[PDB]
Amino acid sequence: LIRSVVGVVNQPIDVTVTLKLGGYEPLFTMSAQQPSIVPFTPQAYEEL
Amino acid sequence: IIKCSRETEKKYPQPKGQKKKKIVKYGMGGLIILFLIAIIWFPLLFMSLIRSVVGVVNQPIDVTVTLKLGGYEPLFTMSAQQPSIVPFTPQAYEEL
Amino acid sequence: RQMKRIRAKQEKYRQSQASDHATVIHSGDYFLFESDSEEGQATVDGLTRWLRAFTKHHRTMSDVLCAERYLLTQELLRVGEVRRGVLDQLASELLLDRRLHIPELEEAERFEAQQGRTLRLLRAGYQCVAAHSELLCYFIIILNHMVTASAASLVLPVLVFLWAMLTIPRPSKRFWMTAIVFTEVMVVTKYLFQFGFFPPPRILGLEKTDSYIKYDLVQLMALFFHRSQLLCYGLWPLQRFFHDILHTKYRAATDVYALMFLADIVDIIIIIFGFWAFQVPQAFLFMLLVQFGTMVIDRALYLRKTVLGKLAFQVVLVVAIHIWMFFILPAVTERMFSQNAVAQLWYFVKCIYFALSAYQIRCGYPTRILGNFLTKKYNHLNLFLFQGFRLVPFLVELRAVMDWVWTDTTLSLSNWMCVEDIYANIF
């Protein structure tokens, strides 16, 4: 019973993407956390 | 249990006093001494084997340097991670 | 006589009961037990007197020799003529003898009593060294090898523990010459390499330091002092003959198993605390297991009473201990003299062990070996010591089992445990 860690959702709240050509400077950095992070609908899962 | 031991003894006797077989004595003593030294020792083996965290390299992959005059703004910030982070050559260590 | 008594009693019981092994064990009636006709300044003085007790042999011997010597030289003054004159003037051989007196020496005798605060202690200590130069040299050699761990300092202790401690109550002149000449050679070579013109270094032992000669003037001087003393007083294929003279001969019989096993127990205490106090722990765990193994093998060699087996095992043990300690460990872990004072101490205790085993091999096992090591006298001390020895875990366990495995017995294990427990409780 102690070794029964129940499945609990751990959604990443912040995603960050960067594009760094060599070591000069990030050409494009972006972070979208609340609105642009959306989970699937079940029907979208079936589509997948 | 005593009855089975007496029956076994009656079936397969032993004479009026004989040296206990050397093989059985050696086997039984070896088994017992092995157990009584295993209990003494293997705890030490486990206790000095678990505390054997072997040297493993932990190289810093990202270095960042900043120069902030007072609390205004970083005059110069920089981060160099893959290419500018290079380990020594052995001969460079000897030079050091 | 004891066996005569026991056999008489057993014959009487057989005759009485007259009127196939479990049967003879299970044969006991009340007719056995019926009556068979019932048939603080004084501490320094005590230390001085104890030292004099140790060295009384050499003191009396030197007194006799010097008493003879005074008349010898006073006669030699003119010419020196007759060997029989010097003996009978004041029965060729006898240890302690007494004859007429000489005024000068008897006057000189009490002069020492004039100085009695510390000078007596100093005289007693120096005389003790004079009476044990043979042991001073071994101690200096072992100490020198305990520092400066190197094969050049390793070929000598192996000799001390394998050849000089096994031959004959006088280790042969060839050995003292070997050690003296070898230390000459290996101090000359050390000094030669100490030069600045020359650039493994540590293993071969020719390294260059400020104290390149370390306990090597002391060792040479101890060897030469022993040779001088053994010279002024007394006298100063082949391997197979050496072994055969070691085995077959007439010797005193002495038992030193108590002290041998006590040295091994101190050795395991040392390993345990140098494991807890700090790689080398992975070496000291294996060494602890080998200590258990060598205690068990030594106990077997003692019960079975094989001098030859002890000789072979002691050769194997000394060679393996020296090789391991001085090559295998210093590569797995650090030097043994830079640190690991625990290793130095463990080696010294094992050296005491080796000296004791060599003494036991020289003297040969006695008869009457069985019987506990603490139950010879029923005083008020043996009881506490016996209870303490019982209290430590896994000794009486292993003592009973190993005493059973290697003794010639007809009893199974449970019956043996019953007998040993009955004896412990009754004692």
Next chain:
Amino acid sequence: KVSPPSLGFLAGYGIVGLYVSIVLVVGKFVRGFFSEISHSIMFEELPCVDRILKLCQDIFLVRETRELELEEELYAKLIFLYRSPETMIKWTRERE
């Protein structure tokens, strides 16, 4: 170097305590077989246990057939046998 944070509690009266505990406990338990072994020697060295065996089998047999008074009388006999070692020498004496 990098080590797993599996260190826990190390030597220096941290982990030697558990090893001493286990060696002492096993020492006491194992001495359990060698220390008070002489006492129960009147109940384990019987020459011929035929009669006690028949008595136990008769207790079982009379308990089987729903016959009960005889069980109490036989149990009385058995208890008085284990309550009197001289009669358990008379009663387990090797039959002539």
Next chain:
Amino acid sequence: VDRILKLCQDIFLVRETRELELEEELYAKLIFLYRSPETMIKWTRERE
């Protein structure tokens, strides 16, 4: 306990000299001593 002590010492002594039958007979005597407390009152009675 003088008599039991002499008996145990005699078991040891006769085991020492590679003499074995006497060991079994002496062990029989010892076991029957610990198997009969009235004879271990007769046998460890304070000598008069």
Next chain:
Amino acid sequence: CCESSDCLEICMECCGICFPS
């Protein structure tokens, strides 16, 4: 060497410690 009785009675004395005769 060994035998078939040797191992058997070794097992006998190994169950002879824990249990009675």
Next chain:
Amino acid sequence: CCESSDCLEICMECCGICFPS
């Protein structure tokens, strides 16, 4: 107060619990 016999027989009864008489 104390003595030399007092500590000795204290040790006697402290080894008298674990062990026989």
